[PDB]
Amino acid sequence: SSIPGPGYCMGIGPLISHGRFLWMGIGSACNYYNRVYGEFMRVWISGEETLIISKSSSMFHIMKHNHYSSRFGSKLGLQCIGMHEKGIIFNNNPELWKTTRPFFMKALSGPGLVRMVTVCAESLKTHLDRLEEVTNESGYVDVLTLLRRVMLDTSNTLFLRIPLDESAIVVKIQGYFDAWQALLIKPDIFFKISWLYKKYEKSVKDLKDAIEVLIAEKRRRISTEEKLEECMDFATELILAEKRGDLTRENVNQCILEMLIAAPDTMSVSLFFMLFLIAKHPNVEEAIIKEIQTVIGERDIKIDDIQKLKVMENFIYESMRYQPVVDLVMRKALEDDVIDGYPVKKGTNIILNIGRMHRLEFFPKPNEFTLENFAKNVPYRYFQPFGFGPRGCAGKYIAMVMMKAILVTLLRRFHVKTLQGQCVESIQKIHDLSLHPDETKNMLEMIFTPRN
Numbered sequence: 001s002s003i004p005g006p007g008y009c010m011g012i013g014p015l016i017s018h019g020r021f022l023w024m025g026i027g028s029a030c031n032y033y034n035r036v037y038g039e040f041m042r043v044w045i046s047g048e049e050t051l052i053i054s055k056s057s058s059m060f061h062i063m064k065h066n067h068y069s070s071r072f073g074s075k076l077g078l079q080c081i082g083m084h085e086k087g088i089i090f091n092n093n094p095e096l097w098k099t100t101r102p103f104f105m106k107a108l109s110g111p112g113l114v115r116m117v118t119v120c121a122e123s124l125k126t127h128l129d130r131l132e133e134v135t136n137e138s139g140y141v142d143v144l145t146l147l148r149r150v151m152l153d154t155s156n157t158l159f160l161r162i163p164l165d166e167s168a169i170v171v172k173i174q175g176y177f178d179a180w181q182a183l184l185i186k187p188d189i190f191f192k193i194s195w196l197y198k199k200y201e202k203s204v205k206d207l208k209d210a211i212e213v214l215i216a217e218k219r220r221r222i223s224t225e226e227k228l229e230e231c232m233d234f235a236t237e238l239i240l241a242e243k244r245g246d247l248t249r250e251n252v253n254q255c256i257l258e259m260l261i262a263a264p265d266t267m268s269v270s271l272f273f274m275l276f277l278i279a280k281h282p283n284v285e286e287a288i289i290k291e292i293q294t295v296i297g298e299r300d301i302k303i304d305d306i307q308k309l310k311v312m313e314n315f316i317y318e319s320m321r322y323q324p325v326v327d328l329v330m331r332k333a334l335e336d337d338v339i340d341g342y343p344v345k346k347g348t349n350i351i352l353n354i355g356r357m358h359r360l361e362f363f364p365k366p367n368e369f370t371l372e373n374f375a376k377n378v379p380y381r382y383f384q385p386f387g388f389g390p391r392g393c394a395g396k397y398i399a400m401v402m403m404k405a406i407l408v409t410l411l412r413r414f415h416v417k418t419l420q421g422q423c424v425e426s427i428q429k430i431h432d433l434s435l436h437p438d439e440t441k442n443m444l445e446m447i448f449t450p451r452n
């Protein structure tokens with residue numbers, strides 16, 4: 001088949017579509033273009049043709065095969081934030097990506113995934129005892145902030161473990177994300193007029209310089225170390241690889257950054273949304289609390305419990321299905337291929353619209369939040385919240401551990417009330433790189449009233 005999508009009006013087609021992406025934001029533009037044209041269609045971002053695709057079949061082919069193991073985005077933008085051929089998240093050099101990824105993969109599985117379950121619990125506990133740090137006079141908790149801080153403290157104590165300023169680094173991480181989101185698909189024109197992006201350049205410097213301090217200390221501690229054998233972790237694994245010659249200081253420093261931001265960026269927003277669903281779905285809240293009593297009682301959360309928490313597992317999956325945070329995934333073709341019906345040349349950008357896909361394909365009641373959607377074992381080829389295959393989410397397994405850990409230890413101790421009528425549906429969202437609340441609005445706080 002020939003490809004659906006708007007006309008190439010002697011080079012005005014490309015201009016409107018890119019501009020539409022800039023105006024609407026990536027995610028809403030993907031949804032616009034999927035709803036107007038097919039569930040498989042073509043658009044342009046900068047010059048290059050970018051396929052925006054919600055068909056499960058296409059998605060599955062793409063993530064399965066090794067010749068889509070790349071992403072895309074402004075070279076000048078990625079250079080600006082330091083992800084150009086450097087980290088893994090948007091590191092599009094195939095070979096350099098290939099050598100860096102395994103470090104992350106080791107750190108996010110095996111023993112580190114078991115350690116996580118208690119690290120995550122103790123970090124939330126410690127923050128719930130310091131709830132004055134994040135609560136109003138009116139008793140309104142700034143959940144988003146709370147979550148970001150525990151996500152950071154968790155990430156630090158597992159992957160780096162150098163003392164740091166949670167409160168400050170969290171703010172800087174938000175700054176970095178904003179920049180990342182801003183510059184990812186800006187046309188080169190934008191970077192010439194340089195009183196238009198110095199704003200962001202400084203947010204990046206703030207975070208990058210804050211982490212240099214920490215990695216510098218981490219470097220110091222490693223050199224003057226007794227049992228180097230015993231106390232291994234992500235940051236160290238990398239630093240020793242540099243100390244061989246496997247990695248570059250610049251690259252190390254970006255990986256350590258990329259590991260620290262990952263959870264604060266995405267987990268915190270997901271759990272936030274999950275908390276607003278628990279608030280407005282008391283039917284489900286009871287089921288979860290019953291399960292916690294049955295399975296855990298008043299014992300500390302432990303790795304062996306997490307498989308048993310089958311209801312909460314389904315709650316999480318359904319929350320990510322209904323109200324995703326990461327609803328779209330950017331890939332790129334590295335070899336030519338036919339994909340379902342259509343031909344896809346190499347160098348072709350791809351945006352998999354997984355959020356739309358989760359409402360069009362497999363589920364019984366796609367457009368409403370129900371655990372009936374996960375009442376029968378869902379095949380992984382109809383529901384990819386993390387993606388899969390050679391470039392799927394490195395955190396996918398540990399992420400589920402962390403989300404169960406924090407929801408248990410929070411809901412164990414507190415009923416959660418949402419202010420006013422507010423629910424996830426009524427929250428005003430930005431829908432650009434990810435799907436997250438608009439924080440210039442308010443009524444995003446919650447109220448935490450005890451149990452027992």
Ligand code: HEM
Nearest residue numbers: 088089262263266270326386387388391392393394395399
């Ligand atoms: C609710 C939690 C999370 C969701 C929904 C999520 C989702 C995703 C998705 C959809 C991707 C794109 C994968 C693809 O292209 O197929 C991704 C990539 C990634 N995620 Fe996550 N993620 C989450 C948490 C985490 C955490 C906690 C970490 C690390 C601590 C992490 C690290 C990464 C990394 C490193 C990549 C890039 C993989 C690569 O390009 O090689 N994620 N994630």
Ligand SMILES: C[C@]12CCC(=O)C=C1CC[C@@H]1[C@@H]2CC[C@]2(C)C(=O)CC[C@@H]12
Nearest residue numbers: 089261262265266326328329330433434
């Ligand atoms: C999960 C993630 C990485 C860790 C992090 O810190 C923040 C995000 C949110 C944006 C995700 C990204 C992974 C790559 C994604 C899926 C894309 O291809 C487009 C959106 C983007």
